[PDB]
Each structure stands twice: as structure tokens, then as C-alpha cells.
Design a protein around this ligand. Sequence first.
Ligand code: 4UI
Ligand code: K
Ligand code: K
Ligand code: ZN
Length: 399
Amino acid sequence: MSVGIVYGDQYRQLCCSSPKFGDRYALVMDLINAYKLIPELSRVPPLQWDSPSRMYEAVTAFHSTEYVDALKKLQMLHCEEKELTADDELLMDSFSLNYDCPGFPSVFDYSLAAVQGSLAAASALICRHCEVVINWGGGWHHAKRSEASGFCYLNDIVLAIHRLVSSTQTRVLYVDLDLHHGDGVEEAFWYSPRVVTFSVHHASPGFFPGTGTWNPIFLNGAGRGRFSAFNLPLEEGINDLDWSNAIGPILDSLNIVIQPSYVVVQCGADCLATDPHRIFRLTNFYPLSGYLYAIKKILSWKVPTLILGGGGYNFPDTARLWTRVTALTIEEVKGKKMTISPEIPEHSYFSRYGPDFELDIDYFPHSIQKHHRRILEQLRNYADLNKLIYDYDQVYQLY
Ligand SMILES: O=C(NO)c1ccc(Cn2c3c(c4cc(F)ccc42)S[C@@H](c2ccccc2)C3)s1
Ligand SMILES: [K+]
Ligand SMILES: [K+]
Ligand SMILES: [Zn+2]
């Protein structure tokens, strides 16, 4: 079927307006365009509303009205340059709109744009216009109902998933490949068995955000959502092959047992060896990149799939990975080989890919069993609670 991608003049401007991510979205979309992939991709325009009331209703489907009000006020205050009052500082602090989530003149428009993009992508999948939609302007998994966290202000992912499950028994599998635990998305659906969340991440004492590991039992959801939240915490230094072998059987087993109506994939690029975090050692190599291995396996299920961005602080290498992810998605969905030159094509941001100007990232690659057994038990428990019938032998053999 069609492969959708979210972009537009306003969307590009708004996604490039944040001080933290700067022009990362521009580099990603321009590298995709420079490799002549845009004519293969169906443009999905960001969702717009008919009234401020309809926008509020859509955003407050997850977030509190007072939090959205505070975020709007923060944008207004940063627009008309004037110091915050003591009461303003206190209000912003109550919503964690202070330290890691500072104000800036376009903070609300930037945050809302990601929601508009991911909601439009969800709709495009629901009406069966595209089989896969990509939104490199989205993937902000940390935002909570009444709290900004990790430069995530509004949770585009939660609102997209909510729209998918609200459509016409619908089940959504969320896969979070970001370096960081997808705490916001996990928490939002903590009580739902219809939305299964799976985050693979680094966890270590004091490492953001501190969740998605032991606390000495593994929390995995509550009430009807019990056993429905999956986490694979991994130690520092893991490469393409070990990461692939760690998550491969989990993805296969989750797809087989859940039989999802939709798959939502957060594809945060901060696991790359060349990310300034310097924690994981993943690449964008395609002859194999763990990212490309995971995406190819997910797409092989032939389930309507939403692919989002997220983390990734090496902007050129994030662009190199996500261009490869967009080419692979076209190949797997349309069955059309997308030949990509090892040399970065001439375009606006060509100099940003120096000094080698190659598509492959400059890197030479060189405990899980216990997690696999635990996750196999959790998946059995999930199936037993929700009365899902599956071949226990088939799932066992995958690991
Ligand atoms: O990727 C994430 N979620 O998936 C993140 C959540 C919170 C994060 C932490 N984090 C980081 C920065 C930052 C800036 C912010 F305004 C808010 C959160 C921030 S500078 C970045 C860095 C790392 C190593 C070397 C130099 C710079 C780390 S990143
Ligand atoms: K993750
Ligand atoms: K859940
Ligand atoms: Zn991250």
C-alpha cells in the first residue's frame, strides 16, 4: 500500500523552532528529499481544528486543562519579553516547565505541531489511505498528563494511540526503541490491556528517567492492564547484533500473542554509537543496523504501522539513520528497491555531513537470557488474564 510521511511549510518551521532540537527536522526531511524518496511518499498534512474548543478537547483527551492553560501562558509570557512574576514561576514549577523543559517563544505551537502530525498519521492509517505513516516531527514519549519531562511538553504518541484504539476489538502494540524508557506512554496505558507497551532502553542508577527496570519486582501494569507493560533494560555498550538478538524474539512473540490492529514505533536515534550520550553502539549500516533489523521485522507483520522520531542529538547521524529507515519502509511496503548512494547528495545541509560526507555513520562495531525468561512468563500471564489462545511451543522456540 501507500507509505505516508508528515511535512508542510508551517510544520517544518514549527518543528525547527525549539532551542534543543534546532533544525534537526529540516536536515532529516532535506536528506530524505536529496535521496529522491519524496515522490514515493504520500504527503500527510498535519491535522488542524475548526475551533480552539475542538483543539482543547483533542489535547485534553490525555492532558489536564490546567496543564494546557499553563503551557499556553508560558508561550505568551516568552513572546512578550518580560520577567516571570513569583506566582508565574511557582505555577510553571508545579508543571515541571522550568529546568529540562524551559519556556521559549513557540513552546506551545512547537509542542502542538507534533500532536497535529501524529494525529493526522493515525487518521491516515485508520481510513486505510496509507499502510505505514512516518512522522519525524513526533515521538515525545516522556510528556505526562500534567507534567513536561525530558523536553517533551505534549505526548503526541499517547493521543495518536488513543485515536487508534478509539477507532473500529482494536489492540495497539507500542514499541519504544529510544535509548530512554518510554515512561509517559507506558504510564498513560498502565491500566489498559488493549494498548501493550514495550520499551527497550538503557537503565542505570541516576540515568533519566529512572523507570523501566527493577524497583526487587518488575511492575508491568495494574488492574485490567496487568502484565501489559514490557521493559528490557540493557547495560551500556550493546552493539547492533546483541541489541537485535535481545529484542527480536520479544517483538515476534508480542506480535504473535497480541495480534495487534496497529503498531506504533518510537524510533529515537540516541542509541547510535555517535550520539553524544555514548551509551549504546547501534549504527545505520545496511548491507545490519539494529534499528533497521527491528523496523524490517515489524513491517514484515503487514500490520498498519505508525513510525515516529524522538531522541537523537547527533543531527546529521539522526538524519542518516531516519533516511535509511524511510528507504527500508518504502522497500518493505511498496516492494520497490530504493537504491541509496553511499555519498551524501548535494543539498542545502551538505556541509553538515563533513568531513567524510558518507551515509554510513563513522563507527566500526566490535543477563539478557534472564530478561527473556521473565518476559516469556509475563507474556504467558498477559495471555492467561486476557484469555488469548496461542501456540506456547511456537513462542518458546523464538527465544
Ligand atoms: O532522549 C531523550 N528521551 O528519549 C531525553 C530525555 C531527557 C534528556 C536529557 N537531556 C539532555 C540534554 C537536554 C536538554 C533539555 F532541554 C532537556 C533534556 C536534556 S543535552 C543532552 C546531552 C547528552 C550528552 C552530551 C551532551 C548533551 C542530554 S534527552
Ligand atoms: K526506549
Ligand atoms: K498497557
Ligand atoms: Zn532518548
